[model samples]
Target: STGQHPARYPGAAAGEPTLDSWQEPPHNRWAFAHLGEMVPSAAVSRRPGHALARLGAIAAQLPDLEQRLEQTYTDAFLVLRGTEVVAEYYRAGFAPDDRHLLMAVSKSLCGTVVGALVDEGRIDPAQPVTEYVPELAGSVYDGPSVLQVLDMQISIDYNESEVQTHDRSAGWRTRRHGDPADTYEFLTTLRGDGSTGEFQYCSANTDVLAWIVERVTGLRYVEALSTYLWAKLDADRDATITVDTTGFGFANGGVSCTARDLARVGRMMLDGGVAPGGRVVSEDWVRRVLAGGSHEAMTDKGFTNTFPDGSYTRQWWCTGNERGNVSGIGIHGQNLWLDPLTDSVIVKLSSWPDPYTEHWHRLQNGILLDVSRALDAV
Candidate 1:
């Protein structure tokens, strides 16, 4: 409740409100429809397959697990085996078709778009940020390569902690609530404090990359994404991404999609970016992201684990002692977990507030690991 916006909620009209001013006990409806209405994400693409038999069998064994997880999850849950949908459950007025907000999970997708551009030789990651966005020539992001931005290693001093008065999260919230403007313009105003590649988790980094992608492709964010990935995946529903007034997709956390469709994204990554047809994203790009990074110390990337080999890579999070990797996560309990070795993808969407906290991450991580073990057993 500490992070809830006062204006967004009810009953805070009289007093000078703080971040947690409006505390109207979490309503189910608010949690259900908030994400879909907030952003514009592409639709879910239908894949031709019926792996329900396998899924049903697993679902039968998951009753106890589901009961244990129901309290932790708020909206929808889905599981997929390779390219097939196995099991799906919806709660709190949500269904399989309900489009959910992806929050920071959009960062991973944005990274994929950039990787595609790099693969096509349209953009060079080693090039300075100013190479594309000339406006950032003197900014902190200017020194880092495009690859560094994707890896969440931009050394821009960003404080996301709630206790900090000058918290970057506060800055983002203010910007989002302000008059509609160009996201890039807002990003350009940010000053960098730390050195490049110092590992700071700033949403502005992804927004800047989105701007660069738009400039290089000479098309809107959604259009460029559709050309490179969406249309190729032949997604089932047309997912929508939230864009600022200037039409810059909130690349860090503005994507929306149904549960099954979100699974398609994980499936795509699991298959090394090759959709049902050929290749949506190159295998090499997927491998690079899955490899985490070469850094010995974990950086301050948001939602990053501090363990060895625990760091951000091309916007995706890597987990596992060995032989497991996944990505696509967001605050408030949205996940697209892909287990390449098990050939499984689990998409979980919830309304848990402050999902970036260590507690929520641990709970979700544990449940997902259980899901992975269940799949491996099969």
Candidate 2:
């Protein structure tokens, strides 16, 4: 029976999985780890001869963590204290090398790439989006500055759900026979009030940022990512991101990478943008992201419910906790959390039944906090 299936994700016998199928139930269990098979994807190559240290187990453990993990539907979990891997877990069947979808966690990575370009003066966050992507001159994205886009302060007409499901133009879903042939074309057609400085949480903002990255660097999004960040990490495998028909990388949330590699990314940010390859992004950019967005502008009450004092900036979420925790959360249970107070970076890749939930989030947060405290004591 499908209900009692043994495999976490059983493959379909005939043809490729449909675009919609990949985002739905049982299929998502497989698709999250195998997105490259469902859509056009490009590789962000790792550095040649790059070797990462074998992770060591934590000297101490959190007693409740075992039970807590069961509630989160975790596919992969890793905890790092400074450069040391303190604790790690992977689902029984999911190999350590398998790359799971980062989902919206991809947005934070895109923001980091932009930071590197900013350090080189290749792009300026202060400049209007139209300056970089002239094609969007009259669209909703025309007026906001790149920094506004990074902070998710643009008041675009579309909401989060609309942007997620409207990916027909990006080839994440089937289109109605295509007019706006690619992601860029679809973005240029959006209508909006052209406002800025208010938290809107639209995913389209990051895609526009991706287009800017491509325009200024003259490299495909994935290529530039490899050049600027991926090659600089202590990552064991090359990462892949979904691409559109015109070869546009789905920068909003298309990246798929191993849990350990994703944890390396968090470690980089925690280390003030330094990776094994050295200086992937400026320390200044790293500091700015940690400082987070303005609280007054976080008018999105739903977000405030989670972090009443939290702020969102540069695609990262500031938890407003005493530990100065900041995180990147994807639709399902995907989360990459950084706790500066304890010098810890935690990454949890999951396939929860729902896209987002306060209940699961509370469990994950509680576990992370306990782990951090346990590590601190040790």
Candidate 3:
């Protein structure tokens, strides 16, 4: 609590964090990257042979980038061209090794992991979730296929907008109060409607997928993630996923890692799922995400306002633009952008004072393009 500002005051690092203050800015700037101190978490341990990759830069080429950083309360920023970092920046108190919360951007990683699992014949996306986690058989998620969930086309009654309305049951990154005892019980609350195939971006879908991954692989979430993906990234730092009080990891979100490390994630997508160490994530899987979902499926989304041609697929947002741009976005300023045109990836970790604004998103459209060009020039 002895940091920039306090969400629920009397700032004292010596005390425990309350739900009210843990995620709001000022408090979040410190809290976001250091969640392990506040909650039970599992480590996706770093493996050897990870060299600290550096990116060259020219912030002057995109002068407004810094101003936007200030306006958005950016904590760490990085851009990469292939495996080489082309640019990097961090706030005064933040450093490259610092692990920041990924928020919903975590879904993209979860989606990618699911794709990899599918490639291994461990998951059948065409099948209903009950096939893997029969525990959710009677829940609101009763009849949705894994593909529908991945594309976020499944209907779920849980409304993200209502979560903050309550403190007891809806803590976004729950560790206490009224939250379901386990992820399975949480899945039961939402009802899914199939007729419309409405494009609903539900975090719970990712949670279910995480469960399926663990169930099918006979491994803990961290173990599966490490064995298949994280350790192969040549990541210079360890990553972590926060679990509920029940020790259920929040796959919909709750992932934390350094900006540079996250850029690796973006790079993998750009490279057709190949990691820094040549560990290949299924190319078809990355292709599916980057190609984006159908435009009709995204009629319910907000991205249409900016990227009118944008589509959401497998947790990645694809802007059907000249550059074939794709992105992974999270609430309150977290973002990852990949431009296949110039082979660029941008990662931003921030603590915006507010959750979201149309202006913020529009600004990002320009920033992402500028970053790709800046990095490409170098």
* Per-prediction TM-score to the true structure, in the order listed: 0.78, 0.83, 0.81
Q: Write the per-residue lDDT of candidate 1 for residues 1-378, one digit (tens) a residue.
A: 011111222332322222232223353234244433333345475842111122355666565656645656647777888666666667745656768899888888888888889888888988987788777766676677888887777666555632122222323344424432345545655666646655566777787777778778776677777777777676778877764433346678878888887787788888878887557678998888777764543554433453445666788877634655666788888888877778988888888866567777778877777777777754
Candidate order by TM-score, decreasing, is 2, 3, 1
Tens digit per residue, CA lDDT, model 2, 1-378: 001111223454322245656687656776788676566667575833222222244433554564566578877888888887777777766667879999999999999899999999999889998787877877888788999989988777786545644588777877775456667677776777766778888888888888888778867687778888899996999998887654467888999999889988899998989999989899999998899789988876656776788899988988777777899989888888888888888888889888877777777777767766666644
Candidate 1 versus the native: TM-score? 0.78
Residue 15 error, candidate 2, Å: 24
**C-alpha-based local distance difference test score of model 1:** 0.67
Q: After superposing candidate 3, which stretches have Cα over 4 Å from the reference?
A: 1-57, 161-179, 278-280, 375-378
- Best model per TM-score: 2
**Residues forming the 10-long window of minimal summed lDDT in candidate 2:** 1-10
Better of 1 and 3 by TM-score: 3
lDDT of 2 at 206: 89
> How many pairs of residues collide in each model?
18, 0, 3
Against the reference, the lDDT scores of all candidates come to 0.67, 0.78, 0.71
Q: List ranges where model 2 is wrong by over 4 Å.
A: 1-61, 159-161
